[PDB]
Amino acid sequence: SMQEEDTFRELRIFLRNVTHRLAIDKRFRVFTKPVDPDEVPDYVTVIKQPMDLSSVISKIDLHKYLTVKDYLRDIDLICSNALEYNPDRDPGDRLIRHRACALRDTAYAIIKEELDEDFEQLCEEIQESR
Ligand SMILES: COc1cc(Br)ccc1CC(=O)O
Ligand SMILES: COc1cc(Br)ccc1CC(=O)O
């Protein structure tokens, strides 16, 4: 239906706003772009599913997210990718891990306060019946 179309547009709008709010945050600057295979060539080998805020945007835009659940699954990636790739004791790694996982926590905290549960549930049911 159109109803259902209006639901997904709303989701897309909501997800864009959340994503923008992470993107304008100085802490998260490094997550706004994919990793350049210059600086880091061994990345694209170790990290199977690269993920970042600009990709998240592309995916919103290409109607690739039908639920917030799916969105968060990508946000989880950004954190767990950093855990995986930058595991060392050194401060360069500790900082990246810290920033990536605060991104995750900020995303979750925003959604926990601003996402209507019934809206999520609706997206889930529409998606399930497709
Ligand atoms: C600096 O603004 C952004 C940067 C990235 Br990466 C994604 C999204 C936005 C804003 C928007 O999509 O509304
Ligand atoms: C971040 O936690 C959630 C994530 C999703 Br998806 C749906 C609901 C919640 C808790 C809430 O929205 O009350």
Ligand SMILES: [Cl-]
């Ligand atoms: Cl820095």
